[PDB]
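haha ok so turns out i had the wrong file open the whole time. this is the CORRECT one, sorry everyone. sequence first:
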Amino acid sequence: TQWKNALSEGQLQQALELLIEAIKASPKDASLRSSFIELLCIDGDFERADEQLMQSIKLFPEYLPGASQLRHLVKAAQARKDFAQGAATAKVLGENEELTKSLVSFNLSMVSQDYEQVSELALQIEELRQEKGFLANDTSFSDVRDIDDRLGGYIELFSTAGNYFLVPIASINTLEIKSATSLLESVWRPVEFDIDGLGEGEGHMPMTYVDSESDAQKLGRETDWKQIADKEVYLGLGLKCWLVGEMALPISDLQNLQVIKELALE
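then structure:
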């Protein structure tokens, strides 16, 4: 096709145009509408993606399962884009319901531009972060954390029901990141886990930071770092990169996590 070629050139906006016009010449084509929905989630236009998902259900009710599932993912992703300011997340951090306040106040300050409280909140959250050693790709590391200062010792998950979860890396027992088997799955990757407070389960993990803006960042084809003001608070853009031990590792090179247990606890 042509849009599938514009997407190879890292051109997200162009790829969308080639699709919107493509459905105008064949509005009764599922594959086109479907491909247009995936590239809509990557762009972040959730309101539109949802609009298209409601239409495809009417036109192709035979694909309700998949369309519905995407609706849930779009909902979770919407709650996350909103959490970047207001409370709309279900974080299983634990009993420290005080930390949950710190996380929400961190974003509330990011928007209120009070970079003095963000600098203070960031340090407090990191101070409370329970360091936990992990086995990453069968290699041992004494500690793991996201480089991003907003996420810190947390991973993100989009549950099946359509809820956005913030889960302490320290609460993870096993984690498996699958390979993408679809366009959208490249940035919203299916994962199999086993974390304290949820047991064995599955969902999707956004593979890119919430602030990603360029088309290369949304596609997860690069990682940039913007410093807040003059503090040591650095947010991310594009593909996530994690600090494992003493090195930096892009999330795309992480297949599995196996927590280092202390025989006596389990």
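The longest helix spans residues 64-83.
again sry for the mixup
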